[PDB]
Design a protein around this ligand. Structure first.
Ligand SMILES: OC[C@@H]1CC2(CCCCC2)CN1c1ncnc2[nH]ccc12
Length: 167
C-alpha cells in the first residue's frame, strides 16, 4: 500500500493519471521519481526543466558535478542521483531523441532502467522535444517495465486518448 491517489490501473504493474509529475512528486514524495533527461543532464524544459526548477536548481548543480566526474550518459541509459525536495532519489533516464535521428529501439532500453527499482513515479519517455509518439511510448512501457510504475501524463487530451486506446 502506497500514497499514490487517483491512478487508473492499466495492467498488473502499470498505473496512469492525468497529472504534472512535479506536483505528484511534491505531494507523494515517492522513493523514486524519473526524470526524462538528455545525455548531458542539462535540465532545460519539459519534465527536466520543471523538476529542476522545483529543486531551486539544486538538481542542476548536482548534475553538473556528476557530469564532471563521470562524463555523459548513453542514450537509453540512466543514473541515480538525489531527489532533493521532491523524492528520495531521482532516476535520470535518457530516451532516444527521434528529432536527433536517434534509434526508437533505444526507448525499450531506456524503460529497462525502471526494472532496477521496485516502485517509481515516472513520465512517458521520449515525448516532447524528443519527438516520439506518446501512444507508442506507453506500449513500450507496458511491455518492458515489470516493477510498479505510476505514470503522470501532463496533457489531458493525450491522457484521455491514451486511456481510451489499445485492444
Ligand atoms: O512525456 C513527457 C511529457 C510530455 C510533455 C507535455 C505534453 C506534450 C509534450 C511535452 C511534458 N511531459 C510531462 N509529463 C508529466 N509531468 C510533466 N510536468 C512538466 C512536464 C511534464
Amino acid at each position: 500500500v502506497n500514497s499514490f491517489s487517483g491512478y487508473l490501473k492499466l495492467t498488473d504493474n502499470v498505473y496512469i493519471k492525468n497529472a504534472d509529475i512535479v506536483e505528484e512528486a511534491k505531494k507523494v514524495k515517492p522513493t523514486v521519481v524519473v526524470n526524462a533527461a538528455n545525455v548531458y543532464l542539462k535540465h532545460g524544459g519539459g519534465v527536466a526543466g520543471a523538476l529542476n526548477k522545483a529543486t531551486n536548481n539544486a538538481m542542476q548543480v548536482e548534475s553538473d558535478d556528476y557530469i564532471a566526474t563521470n562524463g555523459p550518459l548513453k542514450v537509453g541509459g540512466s543514473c541515480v542521483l538525489s531527489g532533493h525536495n521532491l523524492a528520495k532519489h531521482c532516476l535520470h533516464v535518457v530516451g532516444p531523441n527521434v528529432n536527433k535521428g536517434e534509434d526508437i529501439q533505444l526507448l525499450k532500453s531506456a524503460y529497462e532502467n525502471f526494472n532496477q527499482h521496485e516502485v517509481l513515479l515516472a513520465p512517458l519517455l521520449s515525448a516532447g522535444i524528443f519527438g516520439a509518439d506518446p501512444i507508442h511510448s506507453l506500449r513500450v512501457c507496458v511491455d518492458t517495465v515489470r516493477t510498479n510504475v505510476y505514470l503522470a501524463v501532463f496533457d489531458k487530451n493525450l491522457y484521455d486518448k491514451l486511456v481510451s486506446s489499445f485492444l
